[PDB]
Write a protein that holds these residues in place. Structure first.
Motif, PDB file in Angstrom:
ATOM      1  N   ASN B  26       0.648  -1.235  -0.081  1.00 26.86           N
ATOM      2  CA  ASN B  26       0.087   0.092  -0.376  1.00 26.86           C
ATOM      3  C   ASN B  26       1.012   1.297   0.172  1.00 26.86           C
ATOM      4  O   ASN B  26       0.442   2.516  -0.360  1.00 26.86           O
ATOM      5  CB  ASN B  26      -1.272   0.371   1.005  1.00 26.86           C
ATOM      6  N   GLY B  27       2.134   1.591   0.749  1.00 29.52           N
ATOM      7  CA  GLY B  27       3.108   2.135   0.458  1.00 29.52           C
ATOM      8  C   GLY B  27       3.905   2.583  -0.911  1.00 29.52           C
ATOM      9  O   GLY B  27       3.686   3.937  -1.700  1.00 29.52           O
ATOM     10  N   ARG B  33       1.586   6.100  -7.217  1.00 33.08           N
ATOM     11  CA  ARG B  33       0.727   7.779  -7.643  1.00 33.08           C
ATOM     12  C   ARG B  33       1.092   8.543  -7.577  1.00 33.08           C
ATOM     13  O   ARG B  33       0.847   9.293  -7.927  1.00 33.08           O
ATOM     14  CB  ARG B  33      -0.500   7.306  -6.546  1.00 33.08           C
ATOM     15  N   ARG B  34       2.165   8.959  -6.880  1.00 28.52           N
ATOM     16  CA  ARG B  34       2.884  10.604  -6.719  1.00 28.52           C
ATOM     17  C   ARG B  34       4.046  10.464  -7.806  1.00 28.52           C
ATOM     18  O   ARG B  34       4.294  11.360  -8.501  1.00 28.52           O
ATOM     19  CB  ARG B  34       3.486  10.707  -5.425  1.00 28.52           C
ATOM     20  N   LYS B  40       7.792  16.510  -7.578  1.00 31.06           N
ATOM     21  CA  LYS B  40       8.905  16.571  -7.016  1.00 31.06           C
ATOM     22  C   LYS B  40       9.572  16.322  -5.951  1.00 31.06           C
ATOM     23  O   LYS B  40      10.312  15.399  -6.127  1.00 31.06           O
ATOM     24  CB  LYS B  40       8.794  18.118  -7.027  1.00 31.06           C
ATOM     25  N   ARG B  41       8.384  15.980  -4.812  1.00 35.20           N
ATOM     26  CA  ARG B  41       9.147  15.634  -3.952  1.00 35.20           C
ATOM     27  C   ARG B  41       9.053  14.305  -3.771  1.00 35.20           C
ATOM     28  O   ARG B  41      10.465  13.654  -3.042  1.00 35.20           O
ATOM     29  CB  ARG B  41       8.553  16.099  -2.721  1.00 35.20           C
ATOM     30  N   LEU B  42       7.868  13.679  -3.484  1.00 37.81           N
ATOM     31  CA  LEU B  42       7.425  11.908  -3.658  1.00 37.81           C
ATOM     32  C   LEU B  42       8.056  11.787  -2.484  1.00 37.81           C
ATOM     33  O   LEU B  42       7.742  10.149  -1.740  1.00 37.81           O
ATOM     34  CB  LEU B  42       8.511  11.483  -4.280  1.00 37.81           C
ATOM     35  N   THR B  43       8.091  12.524  -1.601  1.00 39.08           N
ATOM     36  CA  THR B  43       8.241  11.310   0.157  1.00 39.08           C
ATOM     37  C   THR B  43       9.489  12.896   1.038  1.00 39.08           C
ATOM     38  O   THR B  43      10.311  13.986   0.775  1.00 39.08           O
ATOM     39  CB  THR B  43       9.535  10.164  -0.399  1.00 39.08           C
ATOM     40  N   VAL B  44       9.245  12.850   2.029  1.00 44.72           N
ATOM     41  CA  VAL B  44       9.507  13.459   3.306  1.00 44.72           C
ATOM     42  C   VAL B  44      10.126  13.021   4.536  1.00 44.72           C
ATOM     43  O   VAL B  44       9.771  11.558   5.093  1.00 44.72           O
ATOM     44  CB  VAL B  44       8.723  14.519   3.356  1.00 44.72           C
TER      45      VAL B  44
END
Ligand SMILES: [Mg+2]
Ligand SMILES: [Mg+2]
Ligand SMILES: [Mg+2]
Ligand SMILES: [Mg+2]
Ligand SMILES: [Mg+2]
Ligand SMILES: [Mg+2]
Ligand SMILES: [Mg+2]
Ligand SMILES: [Mg+2]
Ligand SMILES: [Mg+2]
Ligand SMILES: [Mg+2]
Ligand SMILES: [Mg+2]
Ligand SMILES: [Mg+2]
Ligand SMILES: [Mg+2]
Ligand SMILES: [Mg+2]
Ligand SMILES: [Mg+2]
Ligand SMILES: [Mg+2]
Ligand SMILES: [Mg+2]
Ligand SMILES: [Mg+2]
Ligand SMILES: [Mg+2]
Ligand SMILES: [Mg+2]
Ligand SMILES: [Mg+2]
Ligand SMILES: [Mg+2]
Ligand SMILES: [Mg+2]
Ligand SMILES: [Mg+2]
Ligand SMILES: [Mg+2]
Ligand SMILES: [Mg+2]
Ligand SMILES: [Mg+2]
Ligand SMILES: [Mg+2]
Ligand SMILES: [Mg+2]
Ligand SMILES: [Mg+2]
Ligand SMILES: [Mg+2]
Ligand SMILES: [Mg+2]
Ligand SMILES: [Mg+2]
Ligand SMILES: [Mg+2]
Ligand SMILES: [Mg+2]
Ligand SMILES: [Mg+2]
Ligand SMILES: [Mg+2]
Ligand SMILES: [Mg+2]
Ligand SMILES: [Mg+2]
Ligand SMILES: [Mg+2]
Ligand SMILES: [Mg+2]
Ligand SMILES: [Mg+2]
Ligand SMILES: [Mg+2]
Ligand SMILES: [Mg+2]
Ligand SMILES: [Mg+2]
Ligand SMILES: [Mg+2]
Ligand SMILES: [Mg+2]
Ligand SMILES: [Mg+2]
Ligand SMILES: [Mg+2]
Ligand SMILES: [Mg+2]
Ligand SMILES: [Mg+2]
Ligand SMILES: [Mg+2]
Ligand SMILES: [Mg+2]
Ligand SMILES: [Mg+2]
Ligand SMILES: [Mg+2]
Ligand SMILES: [Mg+2]
Ligand SMILES: [Mg+2]
Ligand SMILES: [Mg+2]
Ligand SMILES: [Mg+2]
Ligand SMILES: [Mg+2]
Ligand SMILES: [Mg+2]
Ligand SMILES: [Mg+2]
Ligand SMILES: [Mg+2]
Ligand SMILES: [Mg+2]
Ligand SMILES: [Mg+2]
Ligand SMILES: [Mg+2]
Ligand SMILES: [Mg+2]
Ligand SMILES: [Mg+2]
Ligand SMILES: [Mg+2]
Ligand SMILES: [Mg+2]
Ligand SMILES: [Mg+2]
Ligand SMILES: [Mg+2]
Ligand SMILES: [Mg+2]
Ligand SMILES: [Mg+2]
Ligand SMILES: [Mg+2]
Ligand SMILES: [Mg+2]
Ligand SMILES: [Mg+2]
Ligand SMILES: [Mg+2]
Ligand SMILES: [Mg+2]
Ligand SMILES: [Mg+2]
Ligand SMILES: [Mg+2]
Ligand SMILES: [Mg+2]
Ligand SMILES: [Mg+2]
Ligand SMILES: [Mg+2]
Ligand SMILES: [Mg+2]
Ligand SMILES: [Mg+2]
Ligand SMILES: [Mg+2]
Ligand SMILES: [Mg+2]
Ligand SMILES: [Mg+2]
Ligand SMILES: [Mg+2]
Ligand SMILES: [Mg+2]
Ligand SMILES: [Mg+2]
Ligand SMILES: [Mg+2]
Ligand SMILES: [Mg+2]
Ligand SMILES: [Mg+2]
Ligand SMILES: [Mg+2]
Ligand SMILES: [Mg+2]
Ligand SMILES: [Mg+2]
Ligand SMILES: [Mg+2]
Ligand SMILES: [Mg+2]
Ligand SMILES: [Mg+2]
Ligand SMILES: [Mg+2]
Ligand SMILES: [Mg+2]
Ligand SMILES: [Mg+2]
Ligand SMILES: [Mg+2]
Ligand SMILES: [Mg+2]
Ligand SMILES: [Mg+2]
Ligand SMILES: [Mg+2]
Ligand SMILES: [Mg+2]
Ligand SMILES: [Mg+2]
Ligand SMILES: [Mg+2]
Ligand SMILES: [Mg+2]
Ligand SMILES: [Mg+2]
Ligand SMILES: [Mg+2]
Ligand SMILES: [Mg+2]
Ligand SMILES: [Mg+2]
Ligand SMILES: [Mg+2]
Ligand SMILES: [Mg+2]
Ligand SMILES: [Mg+2]
Ligand SMILES: [Mg+2]
Ligand SMILES: [Mg+2]
Ligand SMILES: [Mg+2]
Ligand SMILES: [Mg+2]
Ligand SMILES: [Mg+2]
Ligand SMILES: [Mg+2]
Ligand SMILES: [Mg+2]
Ligand SMILES: [Mg+2]
Ligand SMILES: [Mg+2]
Ligand SMILES: [Mg+2]
Ligand SMILES: [Mg+2]
Ligand SMILES: [Mg+2]
Ligand SMILES: [Mg+2]
Ligand SMILES: [Mg+2]
Ligand SMILES: [Mg+2]
Ligand SMILES: [Mg+2]
Ligand SMILES: [Mg+2]
Ligand SMILES: [Mg+2]
Ligand SMILES: [Mg+2]
Ligand SMILES: [Mg+2]
Ligand SMILES: [Mg+2]
Ligand SMILES: [Mg+2]
Ligand SMILES: [Mg+2]
Ligand SMILES: [Mg+2]
Ligand SMILES: [Mg+2]
Ligand SMILES: [Mg+2]
Ligand SMILES: [Mg+2]
Ligand SMILES: [Mg+2]
Ligand SMILES: [Mg+2]
Ligand SMILES: [Mg+2]
Ligand SMILES: [Mg+2]
Ligand SMILES: [Mg+2]
Ligand SMILES: [Mg+2]
Ligand SMILES: [Mg+2]
Ligand SMILES: [Mg+2]
Ligand SMILES: [Mg+2]
Ligand SMILES: [Mg+2]
Ligand SMILES: [Mg+2]
Ligand SMILES: [Mg+2]
Ligand SMILES: [Mg+2]
Lengths: 272, 44
Positions: B26-27, B33-34, B40-44
């Motif tokens: 699910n992650g 999806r992003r 641009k980020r896709l993750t934090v």
RNA sequence: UUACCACGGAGUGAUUCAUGACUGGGGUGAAGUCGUAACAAGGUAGCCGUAGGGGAACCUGCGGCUGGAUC
RNA sequence: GAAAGACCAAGGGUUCCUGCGCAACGUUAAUCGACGCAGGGUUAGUCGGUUCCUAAGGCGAGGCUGAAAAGCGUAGUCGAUGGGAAACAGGUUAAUAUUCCUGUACUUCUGGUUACUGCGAUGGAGGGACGGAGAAGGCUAGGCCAGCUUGGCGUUGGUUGUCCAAGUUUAAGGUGGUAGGCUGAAAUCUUAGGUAAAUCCGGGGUUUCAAGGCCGAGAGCUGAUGACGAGUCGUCUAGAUGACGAAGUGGUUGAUGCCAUGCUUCCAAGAAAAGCUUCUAAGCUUCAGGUAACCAGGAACCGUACCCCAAACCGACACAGGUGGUCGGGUAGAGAAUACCAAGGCGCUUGAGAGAACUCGGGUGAAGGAACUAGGCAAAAUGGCACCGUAACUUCGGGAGAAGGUGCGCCGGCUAGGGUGAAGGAUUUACUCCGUAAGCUCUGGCUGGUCGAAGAUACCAGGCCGCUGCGACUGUUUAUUAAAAACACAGCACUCUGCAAACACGAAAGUGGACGUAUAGGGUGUGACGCCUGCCCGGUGCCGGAAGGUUAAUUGAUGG
RNA sequence: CUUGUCGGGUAAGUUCCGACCUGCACGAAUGGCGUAACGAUGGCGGCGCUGUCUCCACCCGAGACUCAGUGAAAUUGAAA
RNA sequence: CAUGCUUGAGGUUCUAACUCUGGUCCGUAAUCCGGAUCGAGGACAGUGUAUGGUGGGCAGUUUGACUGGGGCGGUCUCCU
């Protein structure tokens, strides 16, 4: 003995303590201790499965020997200790070749004694032998159910059972709950009753003494809302307008819940 | 008054990080999806 | 000017008289109502202590006594 | 000024310093700025990470389970908020420093040479290794006083002196084994144990001795003929530079810091693993490996600027909010309260006037004294230490600081005690015992005198009492209108549950209950304690009974 | 019904305390009746104290007012 | 009535299916999991499928209109 405290505070008025002066007051035997961590009543899904559990003191686990299968070697009692995990005392044995061990302390054993086990042992309290060669009519504790598994029955403080009849490969004995049960005669038992039988005369005295043992408050269902308990709801102080029931909808004033059907033949007659 | 956001760089990475999303399927749906939308980020 | 000290003040107790809405028993009364507990073996022998019960005298259990008749 | 001063951590990310600027940003202007442009600035074997070890917990080869996705979990390997090697003082920049420089240390590893040798783990033992409270000490930091050195002689009476000001500093380490704590020691013969082995650990027997062994602050000495030190002189330009450089000692007091992971005591009975020491198995044995001494060399990588109780973090703001830990001086004082100060920091980024009503925060108030109001709401009042004195009731603890009262400043006279501590004395001759005049310091007693309106003079600092309802009490609760008589509670009772327990979470495997075992575990009601808890089993539940009646899938005689 | 009736407390008491029983519609572990200690709990009464009040007066700071700078808000069919 | 071959139910026993959250051996350096072997239970228990009972534990819903406001009461079709 039992000690009754003076009413010097509001929380000391009703404290009655079980203070034993014969107990060892040094460190326990370190090679027979392992860590146990609290659970809070939560299972491996993380959900509360048994409620009113949480808190308390940190405790080590004492590797008590419930099998007692060093047959033929004499032992000596070094000391009687306090166990945070039982309501009974424990005794540190020292066999004739090193090998110190913990057992559940019988009623009268203090400092010497011999406490041998196996066939051909004498019939004094603290000795362990199979149920075949135990005289009928005697008082036993620490009863084994399956051969080789260790004691399961009559282990708490002041517990005992009576050996009443003997017939065939089985043997019948009257349990502390009033139930007549038949047990394989190959299984073992110890003579006498368990120590610390005055444990039932205590009085905790205050609400904080229950929290010291890891028990959390009980909220009763008539104090809840209809969405929480079947007893909840009502204007003012009501009385659970239905027949009394569990939080999950099970009747609790007299309905039987035993449904085993596999161990039924071992029950001679139920506790009623 | 205490507010809802109390920063912690270690707890941020262990809940919302790249390896935390890659662990479950699910992650991994979140990451694809992003990437499809062009973040641009896709993750934090 | 100081010391002693009467009257008089302030606070908090003890004791003793009178009185008090309302309540508990007692005694004395007259041709009242309900029963018949005791005195005869008083019609279930009576009393003593204690406990429970009952409109009431009283009944019942446990221990005791003869200050109980027939024999 | 127990911060509005310093310093760590988290968080931020260049806000740090210097030149040049003022449009916008800054609640006003700005020459200024945490603002714009451009340069510069963070130096480690010892600090913090990384590397080694594990906790809760996560993931998890095979495995077991499950329509699929996937769930649980074994071997294992991740995960600090914990365990585990070693550094201090001084100097210096505009901005870094336990990192650079100077001086003096410590830890660990590598490669050689020599000498002597039984080496070997993932396995065995030991150790690491630990709770709450409390109390006697010992010590140190720190603080005062005295002496000393340098300087001064006071715009106004006096001030060459029992006068005034400043400074009187110095670490880690080495040596030392002290106050104090714990413990019997050695030899020899053995062995139902430590999954195998063991010279190690554990158990047993005999002999001998009354002394060893292990921890342990701190003092003293040394580090240190050095650094530092007011200041003096020389050169350069109100400032920089180089050289030199005084005194630097004694006495008291004394921690919440160290000995101390100690000691006593109590129940609620108080982490793991590794590093470390030792034993041996499989293996080598005249290569390997180990123990000593000397010589030579090394210790990688990452973070170091700056804010950090805030204008730089979390709150949209340069926002009266919130934010873990450490240090914490003087005079008063029980104190980390309070007041006035020190070091250090700041005057809170719109000002100037004038002195209306009314609003906010305060001061005083004639004569009354709750007449106010739903209600003494608010305000006023009380307030310290010592001593005297104190009722009903009581579960014998309490009530109780019940209530109420008396003294208290400053200066003299006489007088009694404690601590420290020269000289002396003793023997164990030295980190020792006794004991000490003066000095310093801490407790008291009874006797006068004296000033004011008032001496617990400021800040600080309980109002008290009499009847009743409710709840036994301490506790908890509607984050943001309800703190309660509501919830909990100790105690009481009923009922279920014989262990693969009842019960709960899980399509299941499994997990909790519990490494528990009826003096235990679950559910339900009531709610300390005292005296008690009466009648009804017809209804509806639950429990026991099995004769009879009714009764499912299934089967299939008979008839059509 | 009801501020029941009687007593006490006040000059005067629909609240308070003590009783009576006619309990609309108390009652025994949805416990009954008591109870020392405790409570930022409900009701009533005293002493002290007072600007709570008769009935307000004066004084001190911060606003309000004026001058210089910067500069909002809800609202609004149009308004002689 | 006797036996014979069947057949519904009942009781007892046996072991060989099944079960073991019992012991010791191996995989192995492992309280998982398998295989072997002892011990216990035993055609029971348990699971699949079919079927009766119980089941606010949980679910999807229903619970009329008129009406001198709604509710309560009354009315709701037909004849004079
Ligand atoms: Mg207590
Ligand atoms: Mg351990
Ligand atoms: Mg419970
Ligand atoms: Mg326990
Ligand atoms: Mg207790
Ligand atoms: Mg309870
Ligand atoms: Mg309950
Ligand atoms: Mg309860
Ligand atoms: Mg409630
Ligand atoms: Mg409620
Ligand atoms: Mg819920
Ligand atoms: Mg419900
Ligand atoms: Mg209510
Ligand atoms: Mg009601
Ligand atoms: Mg209710
Ligand atoms: Mg948030
Ligand atoms: Mg993708
Ligand atoms: Mg008074
Ligand atoms: Mg009086
Ligand atoms: Mg008098
Ligand atoms: Mg009287
Ligand atoms: Mg009278
Ligand atoms: Mg009268
Ligand atoms: Mg009679
Ligand atoms: Mg008669
Ligand atoms: Mg008679
Ligand atoms: Mg008669
Ligand atoms: Mg008679
Ligand atoms: Mg008498
Ligand atoms: Mg009698
Ligand atoms: Mg009786
Ligand atoms: Mg009687
Ligand atoms: Mg009778
Ligand atoms: Mg009787
Ligand atoms: Mg008799
Ligand atoms: Mg302060
Ligand atoms: Mg400041
Ligand atoms: Mg600060
Ligand atoms: Mg950072
Ligand atoms: Mg930021
Ligand atoms: Mg800059
Ligand atoms: Mg700057
Ligand atoms: Mg400039
Ligand atoms: Mg300009
Ligand atoms: Mg601006
Ligand atoms: Mg501007
Ligand atoms: Mg501003
Ligand atoms: Mg700049
Ligand atoms: Mg793990
Ligand atoms: Mg997993
Ligand atoms: Mg797999
Ligand atoms: Mg790891
Ligand atoms: Mg750490
Ligand atoms: Mg650590
Ligand atoms: Mg550490
Ligand atoms: Mg700096
Ligand atoms: Mg250096
Ligand atoms: Mg070990
Ligand atoms: Mg620790
Ligand atoms: Mg201790
Ligand atoms: Mg402690
Ligand atoms: Mg000193
Ligand atoms: Mg001089
Ligand atoms: Mg002068
Ligand atoms: Mg002069
Ligand atoms: Mg020195
Ligand atoms: Mg030293
Ligand atoms: Mg010593
Ligand atoms: Mg730095
Ligand atoms: Mg810095
Ligand atoms: Mg800071
Ligand atoms: Mg500002
Ligand atoms: Mg702020
Ligand atoms: Mg805080
Ligand atoms: Mg201070
Ligand atoms: Mg204070
Ligand atoms: Mg101040
Ligand atoms: Mg000042
Ligand atoms: Mg200053
Ligand atoms: Mg301002
Ligand atoms: Mg005012
Ligand atoms: Mg005011
Ligand atoms: Mg005022
Ligand atoms: Mg005033
Ligand atoms: Mg005045
Ligand atoms: Mg006045
Ligand atoms: Mg006056
Ligand atoms: Mg007055
Ligand atoms: Mg009035
Ligand atoms: Mg009025
Ligand atoms: Mg009002
Ligand atoms: Mg008030
Ligand atoms: Mg007032
Ligand atoms: Mg006030
Ligand atoms: Mg005041
Ligand atoms: Mg009182
Ligand atoms: Mg007093
Ligand atoms: Mg005078
Ligand atoms: Mg008073
Ligand atoms: Mg009073
Ligand atoms: Mg009363
Ligand atoms: Mg009342
Ligand atoms: Mg309450
Ligand atoms: Mg309460
Ligand atoms: Mg009560
Ligand atoms: Mg009570
Ligand atoms: Mg009560
Ligand atoms: Mg408390
Ligand atoms: Mg308190
Ligand atoms: Mg609220
Ligand atoms: Mg509230
Ligand atoms: Mg409250
Ligand atoms: Mg509130
Ligand atoms: Mg509540
Ligand atoms: Mg349970
Ligand atoms: Mg129970
Ligand atoms: Mg329960
Ligand atoms: Mg209740
Ligand atoms: Mg209650
Ligand atoms: Mg309660
Ligand atoms: Mg109650
Ligand atoms: Mg019935
Ligand atoms: Mg019946
Ligand atoms: Mg039945
Ligand atoms: Mg009324
Ligand atoms: Mg009335
Ligand atoms: Mg009246
Ligand atoms: Mg009034
Ligand atoms: Mg009143
Ligand atoms: Mg009344
Ligand atoms: Mg009435
Ligand atoms: Mg009631
Ligand atoms: Mg009852
Ligand atoms: Mg009731
Ligand atoms: Mg009552
Ligand atoms: Mg409270
Ligand atoms: Mg409360
Ligand atoms: Mg009260
Ligand atoms: Mg009044
Ligand atoms: Mg005025
Ligand atoms: Mg004014
Ligand atoms: Mg203007
Ligand atoms: Mg203007
Ligand atoms: Mg289980
Ligand atoms: Mg079956
Ligand atoms: Mg079946
Ligand atoms: Mg089935
Ligand atoms: Mg429902
Ligand atoms: Mg439902
Ligand atoms: Mg429903
Ligand atoms: Mg629908
Ligand atoms: Mg609906
Ligand atoms: Mg319908
Ligand atoms: Mg309608
Ligand atoms: Mg109507
Ligand atoms: Mg109409
Ligand atoms: Mg109308
Ligand atoms: Mg009409
Ligand atoms: Mg209308």
């Amino acid at each position: 003995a039992i000690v009754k405290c003076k009413p010097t505070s509001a929380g000391r008025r009703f404290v009655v303590k079980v203070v034993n002066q014969e107990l060892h007051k040094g460190a326990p035997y370190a090679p027979l201790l392992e860590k146990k961590s609290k659970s809070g009543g939560r299972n491996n899904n993380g959900r509360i499965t048994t409620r009113h559990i949480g808190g308390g003191h940190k405790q080590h686990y004492r590797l008590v020997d419930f099998r007692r299968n060093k047959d033929g070697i004499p032992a000596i009692v070094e000391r009687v200790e306090y166990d945070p995990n039982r309501t009974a005392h424990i005794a540190l044995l020292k066999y004739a070749d090193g090998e110190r061990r913990y057992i559940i302390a019988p009623k009268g054993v203090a400092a010497g004694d011999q406490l041998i086990s196996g066939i051909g042992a004498p019939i004094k309290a603290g000795n362990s032998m199979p149920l075949r060669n135990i005289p009928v009519g005697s008082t036993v504790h620490g009863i084994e159910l399956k051969p080789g598994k260790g004691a399961q029955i009559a282990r708490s403080a002041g517990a005992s059972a009576q050996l009443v009849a003997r017939e065939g490969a089985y043997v019948t004995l009257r349990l502390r709950s009033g139930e007549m049960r038949k047990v394989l005669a190959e299984c073992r038992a110890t003579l006498g009753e368990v120590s610390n039988s005055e444990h039932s005369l205590r009085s905790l005295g205050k609400a904080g003494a229950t929290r010291w043992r890891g028990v959390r408050p009980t909220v009763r269902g008539v104090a809840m809302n209809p969405v929480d308990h079947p007893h909840g709801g009502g204007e003012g102080r009501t009385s659970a307008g239905r027949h009394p029931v569990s939080p999950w909808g099970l009747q609790t004033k007299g309905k039987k819940t035993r449904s085993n059907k596999r161990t039924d033949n071992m029950i001679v007659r139920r506790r009623k | 008054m205490k507010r809802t956001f109390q920063p912690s760089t270690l707890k941020r990475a262990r809940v919302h990080g790249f390896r935390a999303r890659m662990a479950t399927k699910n992650g991994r749906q979140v990451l694809s999806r992003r990437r499809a939308k062009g973040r641009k980020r896709l993750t934090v």
